[PDB]
Amino acid sequence: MFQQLSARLQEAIGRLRGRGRITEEDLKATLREIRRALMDADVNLEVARDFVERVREEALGKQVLESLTPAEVILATVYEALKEALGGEARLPVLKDRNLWFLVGLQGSGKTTTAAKLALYYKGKGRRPLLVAADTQRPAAREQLRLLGEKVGVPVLEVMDGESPESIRRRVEEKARLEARDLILVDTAGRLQIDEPLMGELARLKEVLGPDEVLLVLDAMTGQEALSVARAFDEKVGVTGLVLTKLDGDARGGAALSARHVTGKPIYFAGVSEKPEGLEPFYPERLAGRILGMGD
Ligand SMILES: [Cl-]
Ligand SMILES: [Cl-]
Ligand SMILES: [Mn+2]
């Protein structure tokens, strides 16, 4: 993702090289070019205007009009604004002695494989995770998680067809006690579309299990729809953080750049490949650098 935006931002910066000091009108032209690059990447007008305004303020504060290398000043201020847009500092869910987290999202989001990859990540960090396959309607969805848990070496409790939330809670508590589990990852039902009956189920399960995090998994390649999905889950269930999958796919890029501003939720993890280790903690500064051609 973000190949076109990357090329357009780098080109806007590059057009400032080899010209000496620039004028106020030159600076305004570059700012318009940056806003256009963002909007072509499907960033909305409000988000893009705010971004450019931050670039303008910071560049003026760094003396851009007096610099012999204004391209470098713009590079630095775009880098900071991108790093800010994407979340600022890297963030992860808080671990306490015991933890129960939901994963929520649509079928095509990579939610179930994300649950397994998260479990593997945390097992490698010394946690003792339990996966819970919580689709009370679809046995195949539960079996998919069983098999992935087997592959990553993490136990899986599967709910029963039509099992009540209270029964799920009892069985999860029992297994977690017998197996000394300290991180419970509940993979909730995935559907192709949002559904009143489904949202009512997720909200009820949340009341009964009391998760401390609700992680919404979104396929980043779905564009502005991902922010609409995020709004629906946050309104009907309540979300604490995001996981963006398929960030390596061919797509424009603005969900990720538009998420802090629009949703107020941190992006915790990024899916950057299909390998079992392809899910990594999200680092806003490293994505910002890579968009601008810096680093790896
Ligand atoms: Cl479906
Ligand atoms: Cl999605
Ligand atoms: Mn209720």
UniProtKB/Swiss-Prot annotation:
**Where does this protein come from, organism-wise?**
Thermus aquaticus
List locations, semicolon-separated.
Cytoplasm
Q: How does it assemble?
A: Part of the signal recognition particle protein translocation system, which is composed of SRP and FtsY.
The record comments on the domains as follows: Composed of three domains: the N-terminal N domain, which is responsible for interactions with the ribosome, the central G domain, which binds GTP, and the C-terminal M domain, which binds the RNA and the signal sequence of the RNC.
Single GO term (MF) = 7S RNA binding
Q: Which UniProt keywords apply?
A: Cytoplasm, GTP-binding, Hydrolase, Nucleotide-binding, Ribonucleoprotein, RNA-binding, Signal recognition particle
Q: Which gene encodes it?
A: ffh
What Gene Ontology terms describe where this protein resides (cellular component)?
A: signal recognition particle
Q: Which family does it belong to?
A: Belongs to the GTP-binding SRP family. SRP54 subfamily.
Q: What name appears for this protein in its UniProt entry?
A: Signal recognition particle protein
The role this protein plays is: Involved in targeting and insertion of nascent membrane proteins into the cytoplasmic membrane. Binds to the hydrophobic signal sequence of the ribosome-nascent chain (RNC) as it emerges from the ribosomes. The SRP-RNC complex is then targeted to the cytoplasmic membrane where it interacts with the SRP receptor FtsY.
> Transport as a keyword?
no
The EC code for this enzyme is 3.6.5.4
